[PDB]
Amino acid sequence: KLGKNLLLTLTVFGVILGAVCGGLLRLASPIHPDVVMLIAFPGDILMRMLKMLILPLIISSLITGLSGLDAKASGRLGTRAMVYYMSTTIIAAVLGVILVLAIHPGNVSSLDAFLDLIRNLFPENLVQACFQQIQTVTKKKGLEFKDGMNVLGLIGFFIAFGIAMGKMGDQAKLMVDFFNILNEIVMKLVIMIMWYSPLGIACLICGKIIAIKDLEVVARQLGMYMVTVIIGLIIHGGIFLPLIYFVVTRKNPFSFFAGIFQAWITALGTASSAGTLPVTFRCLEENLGIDKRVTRFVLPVGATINMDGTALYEAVAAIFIAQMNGVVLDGGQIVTVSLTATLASVGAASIPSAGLVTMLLILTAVGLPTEDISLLVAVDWLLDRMRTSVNVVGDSFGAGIVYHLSKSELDTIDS
Amino acid sequence: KLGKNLLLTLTVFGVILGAVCGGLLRLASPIHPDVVMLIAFPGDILMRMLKMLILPLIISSLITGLSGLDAKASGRLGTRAMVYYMSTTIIAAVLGVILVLAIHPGNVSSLDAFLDLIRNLFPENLVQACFQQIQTVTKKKGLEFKDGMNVLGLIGFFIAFGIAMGKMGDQAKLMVDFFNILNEIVMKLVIMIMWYSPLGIACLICGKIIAIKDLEVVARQLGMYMVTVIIGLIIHGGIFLPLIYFVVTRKNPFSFFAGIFQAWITALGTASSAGTLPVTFRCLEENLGIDKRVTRFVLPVGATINMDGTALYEAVAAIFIAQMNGVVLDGGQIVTVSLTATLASVGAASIPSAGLVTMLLILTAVGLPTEDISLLVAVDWLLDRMRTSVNVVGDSFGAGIVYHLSKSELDTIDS
Amino acid sequence: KLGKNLLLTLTVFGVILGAVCGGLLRLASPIHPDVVMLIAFPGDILMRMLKMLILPLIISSLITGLSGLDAKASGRLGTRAMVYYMSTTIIAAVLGVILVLAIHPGNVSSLDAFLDLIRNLFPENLVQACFQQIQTVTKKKGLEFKDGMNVLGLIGFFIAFGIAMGKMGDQAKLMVDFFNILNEIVMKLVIMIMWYSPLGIACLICGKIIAIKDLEVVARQLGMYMVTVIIGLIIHGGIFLPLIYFVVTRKNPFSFFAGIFQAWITALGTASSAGTLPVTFRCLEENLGIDKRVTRFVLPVGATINMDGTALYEAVAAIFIAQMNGVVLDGGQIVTVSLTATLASVGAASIPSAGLVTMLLILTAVGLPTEDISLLVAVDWLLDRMRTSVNVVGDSFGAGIVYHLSKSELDTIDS
Ligand SMILES: CC(C)CCC[C@@H](C)[C@H]1CC[C@H]2[C@@H]3CC=C4C[C@@H](O)CC[C@]4(C)[C@H]3CC[C@]12C
Numbered sequence A, B, C: 001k002l003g004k005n006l007l008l009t010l011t012v013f014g015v016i017l018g019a020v021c022g023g024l025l026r027l028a029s030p031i032h033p034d035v036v037m038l039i040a041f042p043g044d045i046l047m048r049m050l051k052m053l054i055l056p057l058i059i060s061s062l063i064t065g066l067s068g069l070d071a072k073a074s075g076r077l078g079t080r081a082m083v084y085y086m087s088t089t090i091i092a093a094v095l096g097v098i099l100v101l102a103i104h105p106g107n108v109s110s111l112d113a114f115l116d117l118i119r120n121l122f123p124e125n126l127v128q129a130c131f132q133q134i135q136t137v138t139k140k141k142g143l144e145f146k147d148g149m150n151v152l153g154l155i156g157f158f159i160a161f162g163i164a165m166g167k168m169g170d171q172a173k174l175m176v177d178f179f180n181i182l183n184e185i186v187m188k189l190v191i192m193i194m195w196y197s198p199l200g201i202a203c204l205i206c207g208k209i210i211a212i213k214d215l216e217v218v219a220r221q222l223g224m225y226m227v228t229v230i231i232g233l234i235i236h237g238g239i240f241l242p243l244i245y246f247v248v249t250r251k252n253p254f255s256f257f258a259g260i261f262q263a264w265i266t267a268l269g270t271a272s273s274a275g276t277l278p279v280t281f282r283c284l285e286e287n288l289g290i291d292k293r294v295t296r297f298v299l300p301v302g303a304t305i306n307m308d309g310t311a312l313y314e315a316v317a318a319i320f321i322a323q324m325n326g327v328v329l330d331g332g333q334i335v336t337v338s339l340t341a342t343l344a345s346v347g348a349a350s351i352p353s354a355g356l357v358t359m360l361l362i363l364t365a366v367g368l369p370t371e372d373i374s375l376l377v378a379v380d381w382l383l384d385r386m387r388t389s390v391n392v393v394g395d396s397f398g399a400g401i402v403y404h405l406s407k408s409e410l411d412t413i414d415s
């Protein structure tokens, strides 16, 4: 297993090496801040390199993806699935937020915050939106420009751009290809930077252990964060998905668990939603009787854009980092977290080697320090194996629901 | 008339509804500023959305238009017309400025202002020109960057870009198409935003009536502004156009009025310069004897780029808004108004549903608040019907002049 | 000679006229600062126009050049030459720096400066890199954004972009052409602006003579700068090139001078490295016995990218301008000078009429005033005639070395 997938093993070896070095080097003496900064510099370089690519990645990905929307996607069978795919995911994100505001791991007015959010969804300058944001200062009130990339405004403008360009048809073919090419270029860059990741991440972990000032309380926070992520996973899956299934399909939601149990076990084992497709097909279309015309569209697309466990993960983890730094997010950034987690959930599986840039996207969207992200990587190998399970269960329930919202249409189209 | 052109009726209904709501709601009690801002927020959103599109609109339009210049446009018959089209329009703009500085509706050195203007025509950074400008502060002097998009520098650079790219020929065909596509995209956006305009504009009008602090003096300013716009229209048309005609063509300029009177009446009635073309053709080439080789080029292009009433309108209206806000423009912004009005006059008819973004372009070029633009929309339906008349008369005089600067050339090319 | 090459004669006439006007006008009375600024304004306009094009020039040139790298460039015969071409040039630049820090014409910590340099090679925002840079202020330390274009970060990002896009192959053909077209456009602009150069440069020279406050000491600095440039040229060529030749080729490096003496004389006379190619071919492949398979690749490419005299010139001249202004560059800007001189050396011969924008690139890279560049132009005609000689000698030694690193390969490929 040391030759296949030589990126997870390298990252875990880097994490272990950084932890050992931090433990052995904080034992010597109070370490000078300058040499601590020198030690942690490679991690800062890595995160600067990763943040350098967020804007081109967003611009390329939104334009490329929104140009691939087809009205011939098996008729309504597509759109219904989409209405499912963006629904549950959003709920998951919101649920995660609630839990991270209830468990509280890691111990301006509201109207003005919401007005600033609405203003930021509609920026006045597109070039200024790339590196600045707006806020209401007070002494009458006035509006002042703060530093920080306007993620939501750019995302909204380019969503509108992609929607308007997809309606041009074949006339705008030279541009859809253009951005298309750009996508691979930036994706190639993301492949190279993540190869330097094992050497950088370790350094950051060392920089987090040398100057933590307390080892017994940070390990309690990193345990409570795992506890709330796990609790969110069970709540979302076990309660909501059968409940959403029963209020629409109106059949027994436990026979569905009985039918897709092998797919759940395979997802737990392999920890990959794409490699579970052969098992989940044989489960859905043989054990439950779902028509082949539904699964062959729902499952391959849900395995790429229906990541409802990653959304909850990313909604919990951003507010956890904010709580560790003492930042109390107002109501204008809770919505930003809930939206950016939903957007990043879709791009986490569509973009290869994108599990560390999607968190940076949220952190920069809400303006949080990005040096506490090192601790998140140290515990990802304990959580992904059952984030994948929740993703697979969400795909299976969507496939079971679309067969109940399109049974009559298939029956009529057969005859 | 409630089904055809369901944008002007919607806007006038919104204006009336906003006026009624503002009158009935200022009668109740002194309204809290926070709820006034909440009421006017949709208009702010609308103007943010409209200002978001100015830079891409300029970049696309200049490149697309300047690439369509052909040297085979009936030989000199084209260029002479162009020399006319950009001449009178400029004069109109300048005349408007003079009048708005003489009637005065709505009661740093000059050398440094002109030097700052010349510096802004040649920016040092293209990305910084999109959101910043330069100015001379004083205590030796020094140069400091102020906020505000540099419209003139971007316009000049992209004029040079389009001129240089049009000389490449067929080699630069992949790029002219590229920007070409972009044009429709942004134009499509301008079509959507102006559908939300009826709901937004009304709100702004309400926000202008609730907190105006005086109703008897603002209605006097809005009357004097109409008076000066009307006076400018009669001066420009009646005095200048026959006078410019007589010093070149050297024939009677009143027989020309006698010949094109039906076209003037049709322009007054229909209030559209494009729909008057069938009448103005039958007037020019049948009542006055203009050769068909001149009119068939002059009229269709003059109906799109020779808008000499809109230039005077936009030059008067920007300085009127500046005077309402107490801003006294120096000599460096009078030239900016005179230039941006000329540029926006051409783009007002070329870009559909662009009569509210062209004024925002001038306001942001000279850095003026854009909440007083709501009052301009309330009186546009009283002025456009005779702005169109001036535009049609200017087209007709240009067609009558080009036939006197190209009579011998046509006579020789016939034999 | 007044009809052929009517750009150098125009520039020298402008320099002489400006010098005469400055001498005759400083004799009258102490000249008012406002009229001095008015006199020097055309030069400021010229340099604003030249700086407006640096970013698009860099973006187009890096992408276009890095997409033309072929692995079929005579096998290794290409890459070895490249390893030579970028080696000696770099050495030259470094040597120049040493000399300008030793002769000293024109009489934060180091760790933090190097950390800021490394941070600037990896910017966090691409749009912000176009007009801003980062630095470590002190009261704990903190990082603050300063004004000034981030040349190194943009150059590194677009080098990575071009390398990644060149590996896509034929798939990314629509984009390589796109930027390709852009190149000519911006190059055309550089051709037009340099036609206005003779009128602008003169004004700046006048502005440098009216308010110099001392004529006897500035002429001593302009003499010592020429002395150090000359000393650098002889050191680099005469010492290093034979020495680099002897430690690799291991033959007599003076017989090589004896063989290429005619090419050196022709380069001194014509002062053009491209026009010396017919003489240097007949020297290398007839007097020294170099195989035709080596010279026909080494010489045409070395005449365009192996400009090792221009690199030393530009490394000396930037620090000379910094020393004239009293600026003491730290260790983070010495490296920036050494890198930007190497990058600008390649682009000085690849881009026509680019000898005044390449110096502006370095000056803006290290953030220096660009009004002392006028004095550099007044003495360029005394130095270029033997910068070209050093360039030709460097090309010849590279051709003589590649024939010693590829003799066996050619012998085997012959049979
Ligand atoms: C973390 C950031 C940088 C990622 C950027 C978000 C991108 C990747 C998201 C936003 C919207 C998403 C797209 C929405 C719609 C579709 C159509 C579907 O048939 C294929 C997937 C595709 C194309 C999605 C791919 C991923 C996507 C483009």
Ligand SMILES: CC(C)CCC[C@@H](C)[C@H]1CC[C@H]2[C@@H]3CC=C4C[C@@H](O)CC[C@]4(C)[C@H]3CC[C@]12C
Pocket (backbone or CB within 6 Å): B054, B057, B058, B061, B062, B064, B065, B066, B068, B069, B305, B343, B344, B346, B347, B348, B350, B351, B357, B358, B361
């Ligand atoms: C944001 C808006 C107001 C600014 C855009 C200004 C644009 C639309 C203006 C500036 C110059 C104008 C162009 C000037 C020259 C020509 C050539 C003519 O044969 C067709 C019209 C055309 C192509 C004009 C179209 C409109 C134009 C492109």
Ligand SMILES: CC(C)CCC[C@@H](C)[C@H]1CC[C@H]2[C@@H]3CC=C4C[C@@H](O)CC[C@]4(C)[C@H]3CC[C@]12C
Pocket (backbone or CB within 6 Å): C054, C057, C058, C061, C062, C063, C064, C065, C066, C067, C068, C069, C301, C305, C343, C344, C346, C347, C348, C350, C351, C358, C361
């Ligand atoms: C100095 C600023 C303004 C411009 C930046 C320098 C530009 C011109 C440099 C950067 C990299 C350079 C390229 C690098 C290597 C090669 C390979 C050679 O076989 C063709 C020329 C080419 C492609 C060079 C052309 C010039 C180049 C593109």
